[PDB]
Amino acid sequence: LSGIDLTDLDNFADGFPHHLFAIHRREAPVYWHRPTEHTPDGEGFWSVATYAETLEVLRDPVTYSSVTGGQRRFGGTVLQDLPVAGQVLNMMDDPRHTRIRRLVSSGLTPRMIRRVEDDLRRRARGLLDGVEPGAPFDFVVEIAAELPMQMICILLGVPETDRHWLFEAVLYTYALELIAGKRAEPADDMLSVVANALSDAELYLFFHLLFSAGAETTRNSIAGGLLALAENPDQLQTLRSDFELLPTAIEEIVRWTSPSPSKRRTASRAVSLGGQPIEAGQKVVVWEGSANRDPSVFDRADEFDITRKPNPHLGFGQGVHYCLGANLARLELRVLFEELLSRFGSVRVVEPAEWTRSNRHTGIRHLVVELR
Amino acid sequence: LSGIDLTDLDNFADGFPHHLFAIHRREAPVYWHRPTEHTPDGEGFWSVATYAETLEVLRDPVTYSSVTGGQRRFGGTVLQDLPVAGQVLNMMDDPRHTRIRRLVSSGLTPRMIRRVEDDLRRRARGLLDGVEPGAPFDFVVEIAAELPMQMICILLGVPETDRHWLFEAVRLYTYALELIAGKRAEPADDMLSVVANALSDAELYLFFHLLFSAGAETTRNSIAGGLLALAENPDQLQTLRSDFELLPTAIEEIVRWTSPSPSKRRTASRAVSLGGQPIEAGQKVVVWEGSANRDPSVFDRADEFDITRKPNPHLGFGQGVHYCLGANLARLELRVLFEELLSRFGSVRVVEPAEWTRSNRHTGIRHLVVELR
Numbered sequence: 244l245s246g247i248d249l250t251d252l253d254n255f256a257d258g259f260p261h262h263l264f265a266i267h268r269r270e271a272p273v274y275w276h277r278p279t280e281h282t283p284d285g286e287g288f289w290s291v292a293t294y295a296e297t298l299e300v301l302r303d304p305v306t307y308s309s310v311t312g313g314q315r316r317f318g319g320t321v322l323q324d325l326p327v328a329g330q331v332l333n334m335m336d337d338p339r340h341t342r343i344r345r346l347v348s349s350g351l352t353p354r355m356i357r358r359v360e361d362d363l364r365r366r367a368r369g370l371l372d373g374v375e376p377g378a379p380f381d382f383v384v385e386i387a388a389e390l391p392m393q394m395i396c397i398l399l400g401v402p403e404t405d406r407h408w409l410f411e412a413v414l415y416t417y418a419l420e421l422i423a424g425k426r427a428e429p430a431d432d433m434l435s436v437v438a439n440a441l442s443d444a445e446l447y448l449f450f451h452l453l454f455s456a457g458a459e460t461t462r463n464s465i466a467g468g469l470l471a472l473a474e475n476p477d478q479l480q481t482l483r484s485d486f487e488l489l490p491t492a493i494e495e496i497v498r499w500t501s502p503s504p505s506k507r508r509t510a511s512r513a514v515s516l517g518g519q520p521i522e523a524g525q526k527v528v529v530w531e532g533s534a535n536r537d538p539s540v541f542d543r544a545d546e547f548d549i550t551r552k553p554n555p556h557l558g559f560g561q562g563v564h565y566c567l568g569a570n571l572a573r574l575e576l577r578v579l580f581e582e583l584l585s586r587f588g589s590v591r592v593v594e595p596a597e598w599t600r601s602n603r604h605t606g607i608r609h610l611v612v613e614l615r
Numbered sequence: 616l617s618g619i620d621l622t623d624l625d626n627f628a629d630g631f632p633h634h635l636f637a638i639h640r641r642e643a644p645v646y647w648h649r650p651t652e653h654t655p656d657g658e659g660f661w662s663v664a665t666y667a668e669t670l671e672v673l674r675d676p677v678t679y680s681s682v683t684g685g686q687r688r689f690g691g692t693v694l695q696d697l698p699v700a701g702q703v704l705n706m707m708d709d710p711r712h713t714r715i716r717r718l719v720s721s722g723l724t725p726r727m728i729r730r731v732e733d734d735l736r737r738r739a740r741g742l743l744d745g746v747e748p749g750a751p752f753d754f755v756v757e758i759a760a761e762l763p764m765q766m767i768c769i770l771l772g773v774p775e776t777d778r779h780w781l782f783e784a785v786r787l788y789t790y791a792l793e794l795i796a797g798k799r800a801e802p803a804d805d806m807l808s809v810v811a812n813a814l815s816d817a818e819l820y821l822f823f824h825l826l827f828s829a830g831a832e833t834t835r836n837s838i839a840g841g842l843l844a845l846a847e848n849p850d851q852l853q854t855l856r857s858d859f860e861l862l863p864t865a866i867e868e869i870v871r872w873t874s875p876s877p878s879k880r881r882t883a884s885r886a887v888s889l890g891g892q893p894i895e896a897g898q899k900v901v902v903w904e905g906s907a908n909r910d911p912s913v914f915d916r917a918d919e920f921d922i923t924r925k926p927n928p929h930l931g932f933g934q935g936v937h938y939c940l941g942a943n944l945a946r947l948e949l950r951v952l953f954e955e956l957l958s959r960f961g962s963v964r965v966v967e968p969a970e971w972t973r974s975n976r977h978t979g980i981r982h983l984v985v986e987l988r
């Protein structure tokens with residue numbers, strides 16, 4: 244561990260480095276990672292690689308704050324200190340977090356869910372209908388990105404005409420206008436619900452939180468799922484032959500892909516974690532991408548198994564900040580794989596996957612496939 | 616004023632709308648501007664167009680906070696509330712403001728000012744030597760942008776080889792964080808090192824951008840606007856070019872006239888009256904130095920450009936505790952550029968109408984096509 248820099252992004256250029264986290268889990272489940280030239284803020288942090296200790300952190304939001312602690316001016320939930328701490332739902336503590344989470348949730352109505360589902364089924368059908376069997380194409384650009392971006396446009400009440408403003412961005416001006424329109428005439432969408440309850444800055448952070456959940460996190464689960472099934476063709480065949488297995492399979496996709504593999508917190512008081520003495524103000528990073536392959540908890544943790552049960556993965560978090568979009572993500576994955584696997588039992592990856600170079604997101608930038 | 620929206624940027628796309636602000640000074644020096652669809656946050660604000668009241672706000676930083684007030688979560692010094700309030704020098708209050716201000720000015724050493732000056736003189740001479748007389752060219756892109764960007768690169772300690780990251784932004788984020796890390800590893804004789812080695816990466820980046828803004832936006836705009844004004848006033852151009860002893864007075868007039876940073880926001884921290892109106896804690900207050908700088912109660916012939924204007928107690932660099940730390944650097948940029956240009960050229964023709972930036976926070980020219988002879 245002394246020689247491994249978890250802030251050196253070159254270690255993440257080829258995917259999540261499971262082999263380095265095996266070392267971390269074995270040698271030091273909780274340890275103090277000194278800063279290097281790559282480390283945000285020039286400051287060390289506690290690094291947590293195992294499941295039980297990761298959950299200890301997640302389940303104690305008072306001790307392990309999503310805002311700040313000690314004399315630290317601001318923290319948040321990424322390793323770099325950010326002044327947006329406190330001002331966006333994921334970087335918020337109680338009592339404000341409970342209120343705002345209730346407000347956001349109030350906008351995820353049964354009708355919105357059906358609106359998303361109806362659009363997703365039509366769109367996924369159309370996209371998969373236009374695939375040329377056996378012809379190579381980039382699955383990330385042509386399919387994986389499109390579906391969840393349209394979902395988030397529907398949640399945010401972005402008119403169909405204006406969705407180009409969002410896509411081209413993967414903006415501020417358009418979002419502020421969209422925000423002012425909804426204050427003017429409230430509309431039946433989540434951006435309207437939050438805008439008519441907050442500053443424009445807070446609204447824009449919310450906007451980007453969800454644009455990120457779709458554009459990035461959900462897209463990455465989709466592409467990663469296709470790659471995992473491509474690597475496990477026997478499992479692909481089993482799954483396509485009985486979609487009753489799909490909900491269980493989707494959970495394994497999220498555990499395996501862990502698209503959001505790390506979180507930061509800030510200790511608010513002295514505390515002992517994994518036998519280590521944490522001080523008020525210090526940064527703690529948990530690695531759900533490592534917890535999710537902890538062999539203390541998951542049998543054959545380094546194998547993809549679409550039947551895995553139980554599957555208590557931390558891919559959508561755990562506790563008070565648990566992913567509000569978890570079921571939307573599941574719905575995207577379910578519909579996409581129904582339409583894809585109904586059509587195609589052969590998935591060949593024809594160039595090596597190109598990964599995003601990040602320790603905050605595990606994502607595939609390009610995945611060139613042929614479907615038959 | 617009932618039919619005027621000072622938050623509608625269509626009103627600022629052609630320069631600062633001096634006509635609207637003459638109406639504002641006449642009708643209601645201080646008044647409550649209701650929000651429109653263009654108004655940040657959907658919230659009204661007090662708008663302050665006259666010199667006396669502008670000055671009064673600037674000079675009372677306890678009442679008129681640069682952070683927040685009342686129950687408001689965060690404010691800052693633009694109309695939109697920003698969560699960077701409290702975390703960058705200009706959006707800070709005492710006691711932290713004083714500490715950080717002194718830190719930053721400790722880096723404006725005589726040797727740094729010399730480094731800037733020696734570079735400026737060389738580059739300004741190079742650039743003007745390169746001009747083809749009579750041939751049209753974009754003064755903003757070719758000259759007015761270049762000089763002050765080089766200045767702020769010197770202040771922040773950006774190696775000449777990495778200066779393109781900044782020019783191409785006007786990728787930078789990533790570069791700035793590596794530059795910050797390098798100043799922590801190996802302290803250098805520059806302003807960024809001084810601040811880095813006294814703060815989070817965020818805070819340092821916000822400081823980096825503050826100075827970057829100061830150079831690439833505000834100083835650039837003074838230079839381009841100063842040339843436009845001289846072009847519009849050719850007799851004064853001639854008088855100036857005959858006697859460079861007039862330059863210091865002229866430069867103050869350039870700053871008054873151009874008012875490159877023509878508005879500021881504050882947040883009231885307590886109940887107070889301004890211009891005979893009651894302000895309550897939490898309420899936004901926007902002052903318009905661009906307007907104050909043409910208030911006829913203070914400036915004779917206020918709507919006329921006069922290079923000899925004395926006195927000239929303009930608010931173009933602020934006033935009170937947040938007064939521009941770069942005032943002498945901006946004046947130096949202006950002085951060298953106009954020495955060098957007016958030495959060579961007594962004829963300045965603007966050949967395409969000026970293209971203005973669309974903003975009520977900055978008054979600046981995006982393109983200014985000139986011929987010099």
Ligand code: HEM
Nearest residue numbers: 332333344456460461464503558559560564566567568572
């Ligand atoms: C496969 C896709 C997704 C994954 C893996 C994922 C993962 C996560 C995780 C790990 C957290 C916990 C954050 C923390 O502990 O600090 C979270 C929170 C959150 N997610 Fe997702 N997410 C996904 C999709 C979405 C979608 C589509 C939405 C759209 C509604 C969404 C909205 C949210 C929100 C609003 C939070 C913050 C909840 C709170 O702090 O109370 N997520 N997500």
Ligand code: HEM
Nearest residue numbers: 704705829833834837876931932933937939940941944945
């Ligand atoms: C013609 C060019 C410039 C103009 C018109 C200008 C204008 C201003 C104004 C109006 C303020 C007051 C802000 C407030 O009251 O909220 C200010 C502050 C400031 N200026 Fe400039 N500026 C110019 C160039 C520069 C330069 C070249 C620097 C480089 C050091 C600079 C550095 C600063 C700093 C650091 C502050 C904040 C000081 C504080 O908050 O304590 N400015 N400037």
Ligand SMILES: O=C(NCCCn1ccnc1)N[C@]12C[C@H]3C[C@H](C[C@H](C3)C1)C2
Nearest residue numbers: 327331333448451452455456460503566
């Ligand atoms: O914090 C997140 N995403 C959390 C992890 C991914 N996710 C999103 C929803 N479910 C999972 N995103 C932002 C995006 C912008 C705006 C704010 C603050 C900074 C900058 C980061 C939020």
Ligand SMILES: O=C(NCCCn1ccnc1)N[C@]12C[C@H]3C[C@H](C[C@H](C3)C1)C2
Nearest residue numbers: 699703705821824825828829833876939
């Ligand atoms: O606040 C200013 N500029 C003040 C007026 C221009 N100026 C600068 C120095 N003298 C004059 N700039 C920032 C630039 C970035 C980073 C912080 C906060 C936001 C976003 C705005 C500062």
